[PDB]
Amino acid sequence: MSKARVYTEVNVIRPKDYWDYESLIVQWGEQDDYEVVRKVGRGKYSEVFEGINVNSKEKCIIKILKPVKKKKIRREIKILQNLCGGPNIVKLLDVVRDQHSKTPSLIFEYVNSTDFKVLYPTLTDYDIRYYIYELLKALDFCHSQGIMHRDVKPHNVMIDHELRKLRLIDWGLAEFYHPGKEYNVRVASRYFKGPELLVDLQDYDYSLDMWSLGCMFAGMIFRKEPFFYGHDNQDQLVKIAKVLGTDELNAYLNKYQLELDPQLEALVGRHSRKPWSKFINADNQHLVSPEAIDFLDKLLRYDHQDRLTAKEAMAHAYFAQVRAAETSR
């Protein structure tokens, strides 16, 4: 079986009540202490509003969880409480519920987000280095708490470009890492699913989040988001294989003793690894550097054991000056 290279035993050492979200008894707050002000988003499982504290009027975010199973409600709540206060994690402020319908609501800090479709074309070489570093600080922290995010994507990375604050949000797909556990591969979003999700490798770890970050980083520096534009889960692996090459995919399949479907094998075919320099053009050359390619190259690997950890990534030469500006304080 496969185990994480780092933070392998966190949930083994911690007391059971840290990761046993099934047995969590929520201590709810007064639900009438908040009221919606304007609907701000939606989803398959919730409907998030810009709320407002009834007293302070101070704004917030009210994520009203739809009829989901109580086991998944407790999981997201327990993860948000374990990660509260960590660097660049969205701050859970309160947890309330109706008392009549038992419908729960998660109260978050408000973030003056700029949607990635609007913000990303205006990001510079320095902006990308800074924001990816802030996102790496969030991933390293949650990995150090024995938790995988499993839904890293631009829609879940809130950026207030005026204050240059970043917040990793949406933890409804997050899970505790237990060594040797077989997880559901129906996680994350199509364009950011790691190869392990597309080949049914169920004993994945924190490195799944590093692949998703790699897809984001590729789409940013090449100004081609989504970078792997697959039309379904099978075509997603095909889009990956024509970039990374099939010969390293075959080695990946042989190592973990996996096998592709007869149908999927016909679509993947045989392909040479494409050099990252082939994706440079006049519109994105100002964002692409040799350090950027080396850092990207060490994230997008079939074998999840060869991907950089978050801490290994923060130490890459691509982030040298960002660390210089950070240590100066």
Ligand SMILES: Nc1ncnc2c1ncn2[C@@H]1O[C@H](COP(=O)(O)OP(=O)(O)NP(=O)(O)O)[C@@H](O)[C@H]1O
């Ligand atoms: N703290 C926040 N501040 C501002 N907007 C927020 C905040 N949290 C969430 N949102 C908005 O709400 C949207 C969806 O919230 P989210 O927590 O991802 O619910 P969701 O149902 O899990 N979405 P999904 O990825 O489809 O499952 C985001 O894309 C933002 O536009």
Ligand SMILES: [Cl-]
């Ligand atoms: Cl799940």
Ligand SMILES: [Cl-]
């Ligand atoms: Cl290259």
Ligand SMILES: [Cl-]
């Ligand atoms: Cl990590």
Ligand SMILES: [Mg+2]
């Ligand atoms: Mg989301």
